[PDB]
Structure formats: C-alpha cells, structure tokens
Amino acid sequence: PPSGYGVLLATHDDDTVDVFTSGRKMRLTCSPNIDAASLKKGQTVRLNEALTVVEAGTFEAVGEISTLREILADGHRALVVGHADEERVVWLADPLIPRKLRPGDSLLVDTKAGYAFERIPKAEVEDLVLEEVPDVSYADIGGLSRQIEQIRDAVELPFLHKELYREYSLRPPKGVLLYGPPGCGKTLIAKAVANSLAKKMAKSYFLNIKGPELLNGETERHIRLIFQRAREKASEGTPVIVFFDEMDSIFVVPQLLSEIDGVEGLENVIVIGASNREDMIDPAILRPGRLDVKIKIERPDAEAAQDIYSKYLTEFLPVHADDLAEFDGDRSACIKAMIEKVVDRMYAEIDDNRFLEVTYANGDKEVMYFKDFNSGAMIQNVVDRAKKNAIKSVLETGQPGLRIQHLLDSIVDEFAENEDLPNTTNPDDWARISGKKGERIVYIRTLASRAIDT
Amino acid sequence: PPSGYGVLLATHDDDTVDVFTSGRKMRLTCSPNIDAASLKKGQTVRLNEALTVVEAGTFEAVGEISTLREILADGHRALVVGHADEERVVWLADPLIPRKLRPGDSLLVDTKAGYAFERIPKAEVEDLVLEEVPDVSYADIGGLSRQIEQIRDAVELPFLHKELYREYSLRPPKGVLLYGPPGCGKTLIAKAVANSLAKKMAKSYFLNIKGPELLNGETERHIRLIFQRAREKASEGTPVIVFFDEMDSIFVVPQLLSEIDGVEGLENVIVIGASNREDMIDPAILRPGRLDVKIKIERPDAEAAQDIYSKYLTEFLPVHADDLAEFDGDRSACIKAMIEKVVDRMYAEIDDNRFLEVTYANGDKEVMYFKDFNSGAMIQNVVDRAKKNAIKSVLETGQPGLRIQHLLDSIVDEFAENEDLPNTTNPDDWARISGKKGERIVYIRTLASRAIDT
Ligand SMILES: Nc1ncnc2c1ncn2[C@@H]1O[C@H](COP(=O)(O)OP(=O)(O)O)[C@@H](O)[C@H]1O
Ligand SMILES: Nc1ncnc2c1ncn2[C@@H]1O[C@H](COP(=O)(O)OP(=O)(O)O)[C@@H](O)[C@H]1O
Ligand SMILES: [Mg+2]
Ligand SMILES: [Mg+2]
Numbered sequence: 001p002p003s004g005y006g007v008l009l010a011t012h013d014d015d016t017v018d019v020f021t022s023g024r025k026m027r028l029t030c031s032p033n034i035d036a037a038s039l040k041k042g043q044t045v046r047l048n049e050a051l052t053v054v055e056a057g058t059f060e061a062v063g064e065i066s067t068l069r070e071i072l073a074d075g076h077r078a079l080v081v082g083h084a085d086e087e088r089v090v091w092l093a094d095p096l097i098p099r100k101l102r103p104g105d106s107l108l109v110d111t112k113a114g115y116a117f118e119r120i121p122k123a124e125v126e127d128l129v130l131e132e133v134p135d136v137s138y139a140d141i142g143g144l145s146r147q148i149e150q151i152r153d154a155v156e157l158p159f160l161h162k163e164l165y166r167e168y169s170l171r172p173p174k175g176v177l178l179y180g181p182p183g184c185g186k187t188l189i190a191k192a193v194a195n196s197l198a199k200k201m202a203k204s205y206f207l208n209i210k211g212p213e214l215l216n217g218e219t220e221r222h223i224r225l226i227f228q229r230a231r232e233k234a235s236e237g238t239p240v241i242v243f244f245d246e247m248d249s250i251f252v253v254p255q256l257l258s259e260i261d262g263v264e265g266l267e268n269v270i271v272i273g274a275s276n277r278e279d280m281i282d283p284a285i286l287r288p289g290r291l292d293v294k295i296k297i298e299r300p301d302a303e304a305a306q307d308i309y310s311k312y313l314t315e316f317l318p319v320h321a322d323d324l325a326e327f328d329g330d331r332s333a334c335i336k337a338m339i340e341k342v343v344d345r346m347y348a349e350i351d352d353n354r355f356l357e358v359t360y361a362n363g364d365k366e367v368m369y370f371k372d373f374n375s376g377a378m379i380q381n382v383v384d385r386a387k388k389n390a391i392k393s394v395l396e397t398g399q400p401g402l403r404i405q406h407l408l409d410s411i412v413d414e415f416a417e418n419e420d421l422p423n424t425t426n427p428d429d430w431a432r433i434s435g436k437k438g439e440r441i442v443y444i445r446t447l448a449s450r451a452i453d454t
Numbered sequence: 455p456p457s458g459y460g461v462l463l464a465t466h467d468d469d470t471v472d473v474f475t476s477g478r479k480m481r482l483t484c485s486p487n488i489d490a491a492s493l494k495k496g497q498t499v500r501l502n503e504a505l506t507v508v509e510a511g512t513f514e515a516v517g518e519i520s521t522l523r524e525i526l527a528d529g530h531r532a533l534v535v536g537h538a539d540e541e542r543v544v545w546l547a548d549p550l551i552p553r554k555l556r557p558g559d560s561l562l563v564d565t566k567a568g569y570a571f572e573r574i575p576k577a578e579v580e581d582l583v584l585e586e587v588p589d590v591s592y593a594d595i596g597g598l599s600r601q602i603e604q605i606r607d608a609v610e611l612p613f614l615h616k617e618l619y620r621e622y623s624l625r626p627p628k629g630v631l632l633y634g635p636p637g638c639g640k641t642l643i644a645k646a647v648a649n650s651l652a653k654k655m656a657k658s659y660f661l662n663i664k665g666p667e668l669l670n671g672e673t674e675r676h677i678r679l680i681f682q683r684a685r686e687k688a689s690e691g692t693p694v695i696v697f698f699d700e701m702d703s704i705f706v707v708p709q710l711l712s713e714i715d716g717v718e719g720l721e722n723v724i725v726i727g728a729s730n731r732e733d734m735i736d737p738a739i740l741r742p743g744r745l746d747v748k749i750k751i752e753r754p755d756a757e758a759a760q761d762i763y764s765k766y767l768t769e770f771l772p773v774h775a776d777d778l779a780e781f782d783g784d785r786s787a788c789i790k791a792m793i794e795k796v797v798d799r800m801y802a803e804i805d806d807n808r809f810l811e812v813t814y815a816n817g818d819k820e821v822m823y824f825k826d827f828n829s830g831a832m833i834q835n836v837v838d839r840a841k842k843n844a845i846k847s848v849l850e851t852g853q854p855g856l857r858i859q860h861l862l863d864s865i866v867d868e869f870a871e872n873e874d875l876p877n878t879t880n881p882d883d884w885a886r887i888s889g890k891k892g893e894r895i896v897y898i899r900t901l902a903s904r905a906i907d908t
Contacts (some may be wrong), residue, residue, distance in 0.1 A: 070576070220670065258667055314664065
C-alpha cells in the first residue's frame, strides 16, 4: 500500500479536513478508521491514491528555522522572520497553541504549508540568558562597608519594606551603576547583593552577562533576548537582577536604553551595570529612570587592605614553624600580625615601594607609591604568589608552611610584574592626582624605569 | 469527495470567474448552487476535478508580508515592497477596499496570485506611534513661568484665537525647540502643554517619541511611520503634537527635515523637539518653517528651587515630631520653613558646597558652587534621598517622620554621588562661565578632588 503525506490545516463539522499535500492546499475526506475530532492543527497525516486521510502521525521535526517577532492578537497565528529577513505569517501548531512563546524564540517552520511546529531551544542563547546561583557574599568582600550599605538601600531595602516606601511616596530606584578603578570589587558587590537578596527568601533570579558576551546574532538580538528572559522571570512575582558586567566595551547603547525604559513598568526587575571607565559612559544611561544610583568602588586604603587580606590569609593555610615561634603556636594572633606586617609594608612611603613620578605643567614633581594604586585583585594576587613561593619552599627546602617573607617578597614581585603594563592604571587615577595638585600632568615615569603617555 | 482550492480574481457578466488555482490563472464556471454576484475579490474558493467553483471560503490568512508603498489611482491596486526590496503591484482584496490604508502598513500577500488579503498590525510599530494621555501639568512644573508662557504662545494660543490670528496676518508657528542643560524640565513642559491643550477641549493627540526609539526597520522608516500616523490623526481636525524627546543622539536628519517640511500644509500638527546639546544641533532643523520657536529651559536659581522643592516636599509626607514641635503642629509653616532652609543651604557659598574650580587662560581661578550646576532632577533626587533616610531612621530609631537634617545631609550626598560623573555638567555651563569672565577655560577640577577634560 504505497502512500504519501501532508500537513493538517483545519478541521470542520463536515468530518473532512484541509490538508497541505503535494505543494498545495486541498480538502480531503477522512477514512472511517480515524476520528476527525482527535486530530490537531499542523499534524502530519497519511494519504493514499484516492487522497483520503487514512492515518494520523506526529508533527514535522526537520525544516527551516525562523525567529518569532510576535504572536498576533487572534492567538492562532504568529509573525516570524527567516534567514533572508523574509517576514511571514504562519499558523501555530498544537504543541505551541507553560511555557510562553516570546519575541526572540526560534521556531521550526514549513512556510509552504504556513505552519510553525516546534520551538527549537538553542544553547548559546540559553547560556547567554542563564540565571546563576551567586557565588559571592558580603562576607567575602573586604573594605567596602559603605558601598554594601548603598547597594542594600538601592536593591534590597525596597523589596523588604514595600509599604513603608509607599507611605513616604518614594518610588524605589531601578538601575545601579557600579564604577571605579579595576580589580576593586564591582563584580563581587553585584553578586553579593543578589546573594543576600536570595537569602531573604527564607524564588529569586540573577542574570549575569559580561560585556564581551554581547558582541558575539547581532547585539540587538542579544539585548532583546536578555530583557525578554528577565520579563519571563518577572511574571512570577520574584525579584530579578540583570547584571551587565564589564560594560566598558559597550560605548551598542540605543537598545539598552530603550529596554531599560521598557522594564520601568515592571517593579521587580533591576538593572546593575559595572564600568572601569566612568569617563567614557554615555550620559543617557545615567539619566532619571535608568542607572539612577551611582555607587563608586574605590581603591583600598590601609584599613581596607587589612580587611581584604583577611579574606585570603586564613588560618587554614599552612604557616611556617619560625613564624609560629614568635606567637607560640597561636595562629589567630600569628596571622592577624602577619596581615598587619604585610599591609604596613605595602602602604609605607619607602624608596622600595616608589611606583611613579609625576611631572606637572608648573614644573613641580610628585612621587606616587604602591599605596595609591592598590586593588583587591592585587592583594589577592600578592597572596597567591606568596602561596606559590611556599609550595616552592616545601619542594626546595623540605620545610612546610608560608613565611612572612613569602608575602613581603611577593609585594615587590607583584608590583614589578605590573610596573610596565596598561592593566595597572586608570584615568580616575590621573584625574585624582591632577585634581589634588590642581595642575595638569605633562610627564609620567615608573620607578627598572619606564615612561607613560598623558 | 476530494477537492482543490484557488483565489478569486474577477467576476464577469458571463456568470463565470477568474480563479488562480494550482499556480495558474483560469476562467471557471460557478456551480448552480453558488451565487456568483455575492463573491468578493481575492476570496478563497473550493473546486472539484472538473474545475468548477463549488463553495466560497474566507480570505487567505497566512503567507508573505510586504510593506505598502502606495495605493494607485484606480483604487483597486497597491504598490508593495517585499523582503528583498522586490517592489510589485498587487490587487486589493475586499477587506481592504474604515480604516485608512497608509504607506508603512504591513500587508499579507500572495505574489503569485497578485493579491493582498489583510493589514497585519505590528506590536513594535504600534507602540512607537501610540498616543498617550499626558501625565504632567503646569502645576507639577516649578520655576519655569516664563517658559510656560512661551510654550503657551507658540502651541496653545493659535488654536484658541484662530480668527484673531487671521486678523493680524500672523501665520502660527510650526515647531518648538526645547533646549538647555539636562534635568531641568524640557520633558515636563512638552507634556504639560499637551495636557493643558487637551484640557481646552471641553480628541487632541500627543505622540511621545524618544531619540533612542528611532535608532532601534531603518531610522527613516521610523520617521515615515510616526508622521504618517500624525497625518491619520490630523484628518480628524484636532490638534496633534509630535514630540521628539532626547534628540541629542540624532545629529538621520534629512527625512526629519523633509517630513516636517511636508507636514507644514496641515496646520493642526505641531512638532516639539528636546535637546540637551544646543551646540550640536544641525542648523537646518532650526531654519524658518521648522523649529521656529526656541525655548530655553535654564538651571534654577534660588527662588525657582523653592518652587521645585514644593512639588516634592508636600505636607502629606510624614514629618518628624521634633521638627513639628518648633511650629506647634503647623505643617504648612513647618514645611514652608523647611524648604526655605534647604534652599538657602544648597544655594549658599559655604565650603561644604564647593563643586568645581575653573582655571582661565590668563591664570585666574574661580570656585563654582552647587548653585551653579543644580537642576529640577537634582532637587527631586535630594528629596528622594531624604525620604529614604527617613525610612531608614524609622527602622533604626523607631521614631517616624522626616527631619530637616535628612534633607541637609542628602544635599552633599547627592552632589558627592554626581560630583565625579558626566551629565552633571554641560557645554552650556562652560559657555556661561567662560562668557561671564570673558576668558577661555584651560583647566577644570572638582572639589574628593578630581580633574575634567575641558
Ligand atoms: N574588596 C575586595 N575584597 C576581596 N577580594 C577582592 C576585592 N576586590 C577584588 N578582589 C579580588 O580580585 C578579583 C577582582 O574582581 P572584581 O571584584 O570583579 O574587580 P572588578 O570589579 O574591577 O572586575 C575578585 O574576584 C577577588 O578575588
Ligand atoms: N522645573 C521642574 N519642576 C519640577 N520637577 C522637575 C523640574 N525639572 C525637572 N524635574 C524633575 O526631574 C526629572 C527630569 O525631568 P525632565 O523634565 O525630563 O528633564 P530633561 O530636561 O532632562 O528632559 C523629572 O522627572 C522631574 O521629576
Ligand atoms: Mg570583574
Ligand atoms: Mg527627559
């Protein structure tokens, strides 16, 4: 019994069906065997040489993919765009007509029959818009108590006391800019605020996107998908943090602005952005309604560095026997001392810590030290090289443990490693140095000895 | 039993029909059952293998989409453009041949048949060109009385006194430029004038488009769609304000200039444009016939700030009991005196209010204070920070209500938050400061302390 196929389009009271077979739409009668009521829109039906619907199958599983623009008002049809930007209306097959179809989704289609059969999930798209459980907590962050309070007030506080906000006629902020010199805590602070917020659901969503991930379709589609997924998770009533890390590279702006304005309706979606370059930011992003709350994560001072070191010099690190000698086996007092020694030597104004020499337009010259260019990322890197020198010490001398001297040697080795490179400094620093003097910087020099343009 | 299909093209005196079936154009006989006079252009018809019309169906509801260029003279044909820029003429089916089909509308089409069956609305084009009831009124806007008279004289007055305008041979203005530093009221006035003019109808339309919306089809298709809708609403005889907010980004201009010039015939359509960057504006937009009326929204002086505070420090805000003591429970007097104290504070030349230092080309230096860089947005954000600090004090101290100190602390906090970044300052300020001094500005810095590019 040699037989052909077609796509089912419509079922009537007549007990006949409209089927797309052999490249054209025809009305065909069903065999008495098959029940015409149990058939479904878009289902592949089997035929014979009299062209009678003998059997019902499943939905077509291979074909063209189109990107869904919208579902039309009637609910049955959808507007989709193909590879050549050809825009077409098609019927939604039964597996679509929870989860909700949204603008940006990829649908398998037969454009000859005019049907859309399935939603094809795409990784890359999924792993772009994926929510993550945040790693970091406020206890992992050192030296930023002030800024943790600002981010709490902006993000966390509105949700906890909704009615007290309504009482004082205060509309909560909805966008945050983290900004400042690199390696100082903006990624950490953003994850930590998402973490403490999730912990106060004792059911929370945190989308982490880095700048480079956007430039990977074209940036329009990236932003459209990201905010559409935020829209999805927002429907549940849950708080949704959409974090744009490493935003430096971006400034593309008009869709980001347009999408942030678009989520103003939704009271539970918050946008946080992070930028190393305050100066290159498009002012549009910082206007009322968008990134309202501007939180500056600065470089650490001596007191902050003691806190940051405490996160990486724990008492679960092997300590050398000579170091423990001076504190008679008490590792709490040994380390807290070791952290105070390593910080004092990092932050002191000695000829060994000299880093830059600045020359101003009036002929004056000032010398900057490591104290003025430190970061949390640099403190951690100093600890990691100290650990690696202890691991080398184990192997080379036989004696286990981390000495004070491994850290102290690691400071100047770490700063010498970055006493050339462009990663180490930032316009916020030159602005700050120039500012305090009140003069323009005309010549910079490191102290090996190298020069840097102004 | 098994039957095919086709599209109806024309009906004759012969009681026969032209039908597009199976990729070809046919003359077919209607069955005796069918009344050929009641059939309609572009309608789907069922057949048999004798190829005789047995039933009238509905119109095709899936397929290609094209953008309508125009309707031809005969009234029955449309010139449409498909996805590959393939322009074609097609017949209009009955449901099109109320409302008005216009250039820009998306039409469902079968190009092989040569027919357009339906106008499919698009969500994103519909939300672009949607009118809105304006939120803001003149009572909500503080400190801009002159500018409110100027916007009234341009937009409102022509419509109220048409025959008095005719008497003096005065042609009414076509368009308004709102321009000045950011955060000072330009958006507010534009919707306040749409509001007061809608109130003088006791039907009027107000389209609100932001620059960013245009950049996200191509930029000049956006502008065609907007002005084509403005024509649709102008046909009613009522006023139509088309507001282009946040145009800083734009300057593309040619289609804007062309569409403003084209709409000058319709004297019930007004175009308002807002810009923060006076200096970057293409002079073409400001030439006679287009944005004739230039209204400058400046930064508020002390007395303007009194009026702006009063919009956000109302006596329906909880006020602390200690603050209510000194006016014996009188809230009007308590708040009026609170507003005078916070204003006097923020407009003072105290060391706490030092903002920037401007160095000139002759060596002279001038200290700029907060008063010189204030705005309506900053006043409101100072109020919102105080409201937040009240909310925190009730949680922390138990004692409800907002203290004067919450406002006063909030001033320096809000300025410190924005001391660093862009869009707190603007080229109009340097013009003003360089102007009043009569010297070029060579170096600038904030007073943390930090320099700016100039
Ligand atoms: N304040 C801090 N406390 C503890 N660790 C820090 C701190 N700042 C930076 N670090 C360390 O250095 C890394 C730098 O990351 P990040 O916080 O993202 O800086 P940035 O925001 O400049 O990229 C962190 O992953 C962390 O290991
Ligand atoms: N003159 C004013 N009176 C009252 N509030 C103002 C005034 N100017 C600005 N604001 C406040 O600050 C915000 C900035 O508004 P807007 O008028 O859009 O400034 P822009 O000129 O930058 O478009 C407004 O939402 C409003 O809350
Ligand atoms: Mg980071
Ligand atoms: Mg505005």
